Amino acid sequence: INHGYPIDPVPFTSVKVTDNFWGQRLQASREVTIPLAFSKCEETGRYENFVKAAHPSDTYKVEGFSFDDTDVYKTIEGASYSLQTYPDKKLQKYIDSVLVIVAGAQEPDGYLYTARTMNPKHPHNWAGKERWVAVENLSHEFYNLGHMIEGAVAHYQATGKRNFLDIAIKYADCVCREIGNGPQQKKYVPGHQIAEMALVKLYMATGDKKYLDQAKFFLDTRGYTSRKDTYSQAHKPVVEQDEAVGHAVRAVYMYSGMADVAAITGDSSYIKAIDKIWDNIVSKKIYITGGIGAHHAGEAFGNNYELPNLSAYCETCAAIGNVYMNYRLFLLHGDAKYFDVLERTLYNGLISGVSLDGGSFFYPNPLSSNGKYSRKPWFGCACCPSNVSRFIPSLPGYVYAVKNDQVYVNLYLSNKAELKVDKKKILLEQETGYPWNGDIRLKITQGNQDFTMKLRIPGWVRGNVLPGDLYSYADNQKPAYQVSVNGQTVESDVNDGYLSIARKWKKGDVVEVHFDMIPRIVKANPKVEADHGRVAVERGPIVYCAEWPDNRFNVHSILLNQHPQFKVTDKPELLYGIRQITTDAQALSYDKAGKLVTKDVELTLIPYYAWAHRGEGDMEVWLPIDVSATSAQ
């Protein structure tokens, strides 16, 4: 059943990753992250909640969070993706055992929500006294449904079995029969959006239009209920929203649902709203790491241009949702600028949230540290680890896309892919050192077909830090790029951010691509007060930072040269293999006689994602280049 977007995804099952960067992240997800998250679901009581729901009792203290059941649904989602690329009888049998425990907690009419079922006389304090009554506050009853669906659909696609799917269908039918516009129903919308995107997905798996109508009901009714709160984007009808406000995850999950519903019903009204919201996010409310969410209070978007560094929120879940949103905008519009934003988030503020070994995570992802902040294996609220669990293995699904005769190449990494192009099979291989350098060989290894290959030419190689004027390059550098097909240079035009190559493609044909990767300094719009007198360091798609281990001085005390010169060096054995950046700078301090002293130092910079892997201490992304922004001790 067709999703309705004008461009088709190329699924993650079609793309075998052969590189070192992503390939190690994928291995780490399978060998450490998914096993750890299941192990934590046992250890922190997530399974016991379902067992308790199976034997209700007045005596249970219902504690944790009302959305804790989703940690289980999301880890099963991620495992289920893993199983499709890497079969594993034991993981698959383990999941069956978990699902028996999950199925036991479900009431006969399909309601599955352990925070009430465990102890209906004394339910979780966020659940309310009765079903649904606190849903637009913090019950998370429809959030739980959403993650349950996404988990179940994935498990069905991985196993051909319905032991998860049937549970989701039943809870979905419970919601659909009790919640709606009908006269024996109750008008309620999600307190935490996700059910909208998830119900489109369940429709696509089952053919039951009830689910699509429920998703549309959820969206269309928002803003017309008693709870008109900014926190959950219910301050206005969603079609009239034009700025990203409130809780960052809630926001991007709703914008993603708005996109899915729009595509599948051919309704452009939701699209005209998210186009404006996207413009607001990218021109006004996005960090240079691609993170979103400026305030601890509400885990929320700030005002326009409000981007503080130390107190930046940037929940890893929000980075993941930001990827979901931009991918969908790409599918609607066919412009690479959506993948520039997605690439920035993906390579920086998303992967910053999981350690390289896969065993610890971040909830918030700040752009500065004064120490006392490292990744943890889990949290009371485990939304980020379980989201990481589910995201990483799906990564190969983001690389390509196809519309008819048009093949989009959106990410650069070594991989072999099978593409369906006007109903003929095309095997395509990328070989590259990306993100570490800008050389890409693409080869047709099997098949022959006339088609147009669209190569994303990243914003960074064309002088655009991001779409819009939130940021600009503040050096003199003039990066260049070149493309060739079988030794003939393409000096065709960049349209919609792609260099487009139309020809008969055959086994043997080679595309060669070169992007200069030169260290850049980035300046923020002068309206961003936090970054006055400061610049950020970048190379290719990687944002850099200064961290304490590499620098025999206080990292918060540097003063970059007025016209900083940069050296890049390969470090294959440092932090899983990276390129570090070096620059000649000054470190400032106050001597014993009370005088400012400047000391010439070598400043060593690492990828932002690689910070915090070697001990708590100081870190800065936004480096002073003016004495107004310095700090001496």
Global geometry = globular
Radius of gyration: 25 Å
Strand percentage lies at: 15-25%
Task: Give a short account of the largest sheet.
Answer: 11 strands, antiparallel
Task: Report the structural category.
Answer: alpha+beta
Count of alpha and pi helical runs: 14
End-to-end C-alpha gap = 63 Å
The helix content, as a percent range, equals 25-40%
State the total count of DSSP E strands. Answer: 24
Domain count: the total is 4
Protein name: Six-hairpin glycosidase
Domain Non-reducing end beta-L-arabinofuranosidase-like GH127 catalytic: 14-396
Binding site for Zn(2+): 315, 317, 383-384
Keywords: Glycosidase, Hydrolase, Metal-binding, Zinc
Sum up the structure in keywords:
633 residues, alpha+beta, 7-stranded antiparallel β-sheet, 14 helices, 21% strand, globular, hydrolase activity, acting on glycosyl bonds, Beta-AFase-like_GH127_C
How would you sum up this structure, described in words?
There is one protein chain. The protein is an alpha+beta fold. It has four domains: 44-221, no CATH class; 225-398, no CATH class; 401-468 and 480-515, Sandwich (Immunoglobulin-like); 520-629, no CATH class. Helix content is 32%, strand content 21%. It has 14 helices and 24 strands. It has helices spanning 21-43, 46-54, 69-85, 89-104, 114-117, 141-159, 165-178, 195-206, 209-221, 248-265, 269-284, 316-333, 337-350, 383-391, and strands spanning 8-9, 15-17, 368-370, 400-403, 406-409, 415-421, 424-432, 439-446, 448-456, 471-473, 481-485, 488-490, 494-495, 498-506, 510-515, 520-524, 534-539, 542-547, 558-559, 566-571, 578-590, 596-607, 618-620, 622-624. The strands form three sheets. Strands 3, 10, 16, 17, 18, 19, 20, 21, 22, 23 and 24 form an eleven-stranded antiparallel beta sheet that branches. Strands 2-6-7-8-15-11-12 form a seven-stranded antiparallel beta sheet, with no helix packed on it. It has a six-stranded mixed beta sheet with strand order 1-4-5-9-14-13, with no helix packed on it. Strand 6 and strand 7 form a beta hairpin. Helix 1 runs antiparallel to helix 3 (69-85), helix 8 (195-206) runs antiparallel to helix 9 (209-221) and helix 9 (209-221) packs across helix 10 (248-265). The longest helix has 23 residues, at 21-43. The radius of gyration is 25 Å and the shape is globular. The N and C termini lie far apart (63 Å). 52% of the residues are buried. Residues 406-517 form the Non-reducing end beta-L-arabinofuranosidase-like GH127 middle domain. Pfam families: Beta-AFase-like_GH127_cat, Glyco_hydro127C, Glyco_hydro127M.
